[PDB]
């Protein structure tokens, strides 16, 4: 009897590789994994906790026949790569309202990656955290309890000092219900200011027309992204920024691409409007030629009338990390800057103090002051993240 609604919250799943993040997500959503899964959440008002919490319209799982009460629909962020996840939250490409730090009771805490992940959540201010001690099935209770104390010891004196710790077995799907109860308790849905100008980061763009489609049946390009703020609706006039690269003889510039929203969809469900939360599929009137093969990846979308600065040069108040996912930043250097879902190369003009200037090879849209950017440098032929900062307009 549950309603079909868009996910209203984003929960990031982090932790060292091989600790059980994907299995965990699959144990919660029943979906295998940017990895992304959604799931409804309900509660059997008659039953007892944690068992009373469910992911589907049934209370049999805990001895009841009443229709469970629908709570909300949530989505999870889970990537296979360690550095992709780091780039995701550090650049703000994917909205995270909370996070679940996965810890394998199997190995020692904290591992190298699990460590970087904790500093990141601190960096991006993601307060609502739940530490999940996983794979407890392959350790003795004595061992389980030991690590617990180590974790609590690690969180002591930090913002994560009172963060709850839940032991589960993603593999055998045990205490998954306690985790759900935990999510509802510690990762509440945030208030959303729907009056802010609509802004969506483009993470994917496709041409869904199968070869051989008659021209009259041609469909507009599809955009896939995460709505950062505001409310998008079907029929709204919107624009892609920076837009279309235009060359007029010696002058090269970028023009906003105006279009219209023809459809809004979450998974296999369609809507007339979309608020922040989850990953959305937007149909438009755009020439498929512009969206095919993720060609708009890195762009942002907003209402056709929004006033958005599109700049070639930017100033970044920065901070360097203690490790490479660390020599100082020097002028005449070429760094990779990730603003939202876009990644652009650029050379440093000035370097005075906790601040820098950058000449971008491609301009970027700053829909707001102090948006986050990840800073990476090419080491031994491959670009590695070495810092982060805020773009100042």
């Amino acid at each position: 009897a549950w309603p079909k609604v868009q996910p209203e919250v984003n929960i990031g799943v982090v932790g060292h590789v091989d600790h059980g993040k994907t299995t965990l997500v699959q144990a919660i959503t029943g979906i295998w994994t940017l990895g992304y899964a959604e799931t409804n959440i309900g509660v059997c008002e008659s039953c007892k906790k944690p068992e009373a919490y469910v992911t589907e319209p049934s209370c049999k799982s805990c001895g009841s026949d009443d229709e469970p009460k629908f709570l909300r629909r949530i989505s999870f962020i889970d990537a296979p790569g360690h550095e992709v996840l780091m780039a995701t939250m550090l650049s703000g490409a994917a909205l995270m309202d909370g996070a679940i730090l996965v810890v394998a009771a199997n190995e020692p805490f904290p591992q190298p990656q699990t460590r970087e992940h904790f500093v990141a959540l601190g960096i991006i201010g993601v307060k609502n955290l739940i530490i999940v001690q996983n794979k407890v099935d392959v350790v003795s209770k004595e061992e389980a309890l030991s690590q617990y104390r180590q974790i609590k010891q690690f969180t002591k004196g930090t913002w994560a000092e009172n963060v709850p710790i839940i032991p589960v077995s993603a593999l055998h799907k045990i205490n998954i219900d306690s985790l759900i109860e935990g999510i509802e308790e510690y990762i509440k849905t945030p208030y959303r200011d729907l009056s802010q100008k609509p802004v969506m980061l483009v993470i994917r763009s496709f041409d869904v027309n199968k070869p051989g489609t008659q021209f009259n049946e041609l469909k507009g390009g599809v955009i896939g992204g995460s709505i950062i703020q505001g409310l998008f609706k079907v029929d709204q006039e919107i624009k892609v920024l920076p837009g279309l690269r235009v060359e007029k003889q010696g002058k090269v510039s970028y023009e906003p691409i105006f279009t219209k929203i023809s459809s809004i969809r979450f998974g296999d469900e369609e809507f007339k409007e979309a608020k922040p939360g989850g990953l959305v599929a937007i149909g438009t009137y755009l020439d498929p030629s512009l969206t095919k093969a993720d060609n708009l990846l890195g762009s942002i979308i907003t209402l056709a009338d929004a006033e958005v600065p599109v700049l070639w040069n930017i100033r970044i108040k920065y901070n360097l990390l203690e490790r490479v996912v660390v020599d100082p930043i020097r002028a005449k250097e070429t760094l990779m800057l990730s603003v939202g879902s876009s990644t652009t190369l650029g050379i440093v003009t000035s370097v005075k103090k906790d601040e820098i200037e950058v000449e971008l090879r491609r301009p970027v849209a700053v829909w707001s002051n102090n948006i986050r950017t990840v800073i990476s440098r090419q080491i031994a032929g491959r670009w590695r993240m070495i810092g982060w900062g805020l773009v100042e307009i």
Partner: peptide, 18 residues
């Protein structure tokens, strides 16, 4: 968020392990 709290959940886990 207490140890006793964590422990009870921990006992619930092993009590269902095959």
């Amino acid at each position: 968020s207490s140890e006793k709290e964590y422990v009870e959940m921990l006992d619930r886990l092993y009590s269902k392990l095959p």
